[PDB]
Amino acid sequence: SFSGYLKLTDNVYIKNADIVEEAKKVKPTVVVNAANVYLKHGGGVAGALNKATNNAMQVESDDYIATNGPLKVGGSCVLSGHNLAKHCLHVVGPNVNKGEDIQLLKSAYENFNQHEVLLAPLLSAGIFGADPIHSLRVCVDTVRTNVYLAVFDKNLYDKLVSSFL
């Protein structure tokens, strides 16, 4: 299972790791995707997770959207984890680069509470434009279940650990 994580709180752990490599190694029950409302897995974590599934995540996601329509910002859906995990929890954090309300980041993290353990990225961080330090703070203050955060960028991982209150 999960190895090499730094414990931040009772239930939040963090590691400088590529979430795709981490998912292939652990095969967790749940891997969180940093999804958008259309489940178009183009870039960032979504593009990387989808490419690791050989586009099977995108094919499944297009069928989900055809049936259900788009997700809400702050919402989620559970789909297959493919070769990476049992399930993928596609969570939509607000995209600050699209002017979405950063207050929706807490609602996005609340989706994690429906799963006893998750491998996840920092929601709304990276190409979503939010401050990752704020994302980590909202994560620790919102998620009560066991979350193993994979931070791809070493420099950001170091900054997140060194500034963690």
Ligand X SMILES: O=C(O)[C@@H]1CCC[C@@H]1c1ccsc1
Residues that bind ligand X (CB under 6 A): 19, 44-45, 48, 121-122, 125-126, 132, 151-153, 156
Handedness of CA 36, 57, 140, 114 (dihedral sign): positive
Tokens of 92: 């939509």
Nearer to ligand X, 45 or 118 (CB): 45
Q: How far is residue 65's CA from residue 79's CA, in Å, rounded to a whole number?
A: 11
Q: How far is the CB of 68 from ligand X (least distance, A)?
A: 25
Residue whose CB is less far from ligand X, 63 or 98 = 98
**Minimal distance, residue 122 CB to ligand X, in Å:** 4
Beta bridge partners of 149: 14, 120
Stated as kind and residue range, the H or E segment containing 139 is helix 132-142
Task: State the nearest-atom distance from the C-beta of 45 to ligand X, in Å.
Answer: 4
Q: Which is nearer to ligand X, 109 or 152 (CB)?
A: 152
Q: How far is the CB of 126 from ligand X (least distance, A)?
A: 3
CA distance 130 to 140: 16
Nearer to ligand X, 72 or 154 (CB): 154
Cα angle at 110 between 56 and 60, to 5 degrees?
15
